[PDB]
Design a binder for this molecule. Structure first.
Ligand code: LZ1
Length: 278
């Protein structure tokens, strides 16, 4: 870490603290993540998954037996973007461009069999050019919020799929549109039960195999599903339709990233630029 001057704390994950930092030699500004042999090998495969919609891992410094990840630096995240836009909301054309770009990112990682596992507005980073990028991709495998967790994770599936990322990104899409979190659980059972209340308690009709999942209980209350027009107004039909498919209970029915890219909602995509105050 001797090659860097820490200019400020950009945040604190479960893994460790992130710092905005300046390369003493190059003067490139980067985000420096302090973490805390298999983890080494996994992290080094991440150095090779490069895409415009993935925050670039620049370097990996294993020294004195600590681990530092040097990332491409961006000035804002979508969480901060949202709180800033809450009065008027993010315009639909920009919401739509953000979703499209993230889906692109996901389609890439997913085709290389890498999952994110922990998508949330704080790890979605934006720039002045209207780009949006996925941060912390692949780090969960390498080693607090439940709001974006897929139901098969909550029900105790150990072997879950890329579908878990589509679920989280659905939850985020709805949050951009409405300016409220979709399913703000403050425990595992609260999170599961908020999902049930909105989408209906899942059963064998909608999700074959559900009743045999590890933490499924026949004693779960039986709530009826709500209409989507009540969940995310004033989103149009194409958008509700797509959101519906990203929030399918059965991971095997849930839309893939690559198929979501083809949905009619994206017919008139554009790439607006946000007004960001840095
Ligand atoms: C977390 C991870 C990577 C990052 N790059 N820029 C800001 C930031 C935050």
């Amino acid at each position: 870490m001797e090659n860097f001057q820490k200019v400020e704390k950009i945040g604190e994950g479960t893994y460790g603290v992130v710092y905005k930092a300046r390369n003493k030699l190059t003067g490139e500004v980067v985000a420096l993540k302090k973490i805390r042999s298999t983890a080494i090998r996994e992290i080094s495969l991440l150095k090779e998954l490069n895409h415009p919609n993935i925050v670039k891992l620049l370097d990996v410094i294993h020294t004195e037996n600590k681990l530092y990840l040097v990332f491409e630096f961006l000035h804002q995240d979508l969480k901060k973007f949202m709180d800033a836009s809450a009065l008027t909301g993010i315009p639909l054309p920009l919401i739509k461009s953000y979703l499209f770009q993230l889906l692109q990112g996901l389609a890439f990682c997913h085709s290389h069999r890498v999952l994110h596992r922990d998508l949330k507005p704080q790890n979605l980073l934006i720039n002045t050019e209207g780009a949006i990028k996925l941060a912390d991709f692949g780090l969960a495998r390498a080693f607090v919020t439940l709001w974006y967790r897929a139901p098969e994770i909550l029900l105790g599936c150990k072997y879950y799929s890329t579908a878990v990322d589509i679920w989280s990104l659905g939850c985020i899409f709805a949050e951009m549109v409405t300016r409220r979190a979709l399913f703000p659980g403050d425990s595992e059972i609260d999170q599961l039960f908020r999902i049930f209340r909105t989408l209906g308690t899942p059963d064998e009709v909608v999700w074959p195999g559900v009743t045999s999942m590890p933490d499924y209980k026949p004693s779960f209350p039986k709530w009826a599903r709500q209409d989507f027009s009540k969940v995310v107004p004033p989103l149009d039909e194409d958008g509700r339709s797509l959101l519906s498919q990203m929030l399918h209970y059965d991971p095997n029915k849930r839309i893939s990233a690559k198929a979501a890219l083809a949905h009619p909602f994206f017919q008139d995509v554009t790439k607006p630029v946000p007004h960001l105050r840095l």
